[PDB]
Amino acid sequence: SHMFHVILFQPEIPPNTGNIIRLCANAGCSLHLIEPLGFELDAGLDYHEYASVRRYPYLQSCLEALGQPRLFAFTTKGSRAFHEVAYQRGDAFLFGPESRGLPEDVRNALPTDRRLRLPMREGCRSLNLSNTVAVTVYEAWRQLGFAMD
Amino acid sequence: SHMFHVILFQPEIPPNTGNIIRLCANAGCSLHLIEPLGFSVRRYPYLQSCLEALGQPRLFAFTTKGSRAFHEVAYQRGDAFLFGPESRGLPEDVRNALPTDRRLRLPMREGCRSLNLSNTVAVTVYEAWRQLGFAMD
């Protein structure tokens, strides 16, 4: 059983996903990838991290397999800072691809208060995707005492 | 003028540094590399010269050997954060030159390897930044 579920929508850059696998193993998250991926799921990682990663043809297929978890989408076009939420066990965190970000139809399927953004300084480049996932997951984990369950 | 100072001790992998540059620019951090490398951003020959050039700020080091969880510190504007390399980690004599209550660890599941270097920096800086209300100053 996993504290949180990380969902990467059409990830493109192999080392980002590799770093995210390591993050999820450390924090106790499950990892789900929505096809098509920009790379083949073949770098430093073990078996008990790499073998639990799941792929799905469509985002809805993933959400159905997860039992329709509480879902947050992390997007610069987000109405609300990510740290304002009170996260809880079983929450799912949805991130867009490195070069495109989430489709409009995916983002708008969520309530306005569940489209979240990290604090960005105006004029700056985007954060690297795996850094964004790590900061999000550790904020949610911090709110739960860093419990290992 | 920079809220925090990120100090990388002998960083090895370039992509981590590209990620960390972007993280620091967003959080308002300066970036400092202690030479030698393997590939608001400056380089230094040894650690004390960076600390001096920075005005000797409060210094925390982030390590698995850490005596204290990173989220238990109350961070302040001007704090400096020291991270060891990807391949072998902070030298023993560098880490032991910090007070015990300033050698911090990120929460680790048993039997897990450390986070990527740039992910460790990202989580550390954003927790400090969160404590300061994510002020852009």
Side-chain angles (χ1 to χ4, degrees):
Chain A
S1 193
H2 294 92
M3 182 154 300
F4 311 117
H5 313 287
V6 171
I7 303 160
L8 303 187
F9 190 88
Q10 301 181 6
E12 298 162 346
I13 306 281
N16 281 344
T17 291
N19 286 333
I20 290 165
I21 289 161
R22 167 90 68 214
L23 159 80
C24 288
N26 287 28
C29 307
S30 64
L31 180 56
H32 311 267
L33 317 177
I34 315 302
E35 305 178 323
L37 322 178
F39 49 89
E40 230 59 63
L41 203 51
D42 276 344
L45 320 164
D46 294 20
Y47 178 100
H48 261 246
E49 316 171 286
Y50 171 65
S52 38
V53 186
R54 300 185 176 268
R55 305 166 49 154
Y56 310 78
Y58 304 109
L59 172 59
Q60 265 308 316
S61 312
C62 171
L63 297 181
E64 273 305 306
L66 285 171
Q68 299 296 337
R70 221 166 70 131
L71 182 66
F72 303 83
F74 292 81
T75 166
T76 60
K77 297 146 85 91
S79 324
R80 181 181 189 214
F82 78 122
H83 68 290
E84 297 178 17
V85 176
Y87 296 103
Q88 76 186 22
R89 280 170 184 79
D91 282 353
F93 306 139
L94 174 66
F95 307 85
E98 290 90 328
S99 75
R100 284 167 290 120
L102 291 174
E104 204 189 354
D105 293 319
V106 165
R107 285 181 280 110
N108 290 348
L110 284 96
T112 298
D113 69 298
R114 292 193 175 162
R115 302 169 208 158
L116 312 174
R117 63 183 149 71
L118 302 213
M120 298 291 303
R121 179 177 318 273
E122 311 230 359
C124 289
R125 304 174 165 79
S126 64
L127 292 193
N128 163 268
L129 174 55
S130 77
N131 294 173
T132 292
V133 176
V135 163
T136 307
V137 161
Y138 266 70
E139 166 57 19
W141 201 16
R142 177 194 70 74
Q143 288 182 23
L144 304 189
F146 293 109
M148 310 296 309
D149 291 10
Chain B
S1 200
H2 290 99
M3 178 164 290
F4 307 115
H5 313 290
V6 171
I7 299 169
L8 304 185
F9 192 94
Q10 310 215 156
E12 292 154 354
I13 285 85
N16 286 338
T17 288
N19 295 351
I20 290 163
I21 283 163
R22 282 197 271 161
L23 183 119
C24 292
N26 202 59
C29 300
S30 63
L31 180 53
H32 312 265
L33 317 165
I34 315 308
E35 281 174 347
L37 323 182
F39 48 87
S40 300
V41 174
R42 298 136 163 286
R43 304 170 51 150
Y44 308 74
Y46 61 92
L47 175 58
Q48 214 53 221
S49 78
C50 174
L51 299 186
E52 292 263 13
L54 280 173
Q56 219 78 33
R58 216 157 69 127
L59 184 65
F60 303 89
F62 295 84
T63 166
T64 53
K65 184 213 232 151
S67 81
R68 196 178 175 206
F70 78 127
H71 65 300
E72 301 180 345
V73 180
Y75 296 101
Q76 299 169 6
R77 270 169 190 75
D79 282 354
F81 309 134
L82 177 60
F83 308 84
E86 304 90 326
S87 297
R88 297 267 132 173
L90 279 178
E92 206 196 353
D93 88 320
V94 181
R95 174 177 49 268
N96 256 265
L98 276 85
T100 286
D101 69 303
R102 290 190 174 163
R103 314 168 207 179
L104 320 168
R105 53 177 161 80
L106 291 66
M108 280 285 298
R109 196 164 301 268
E110 279 239 338
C112 277
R113 273 311 331 190
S114 59
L115 288 188
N116 166 264
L117 172 57
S118 79
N119 281 356
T120 297
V121 173
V123 164
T124 293
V125 167
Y126 265 66
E127 165 62 16
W129 201 17
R130 183 195 65 80
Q131 287 182 19
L132 303 196
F134 295 112
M136 301 286 165
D137 291 8

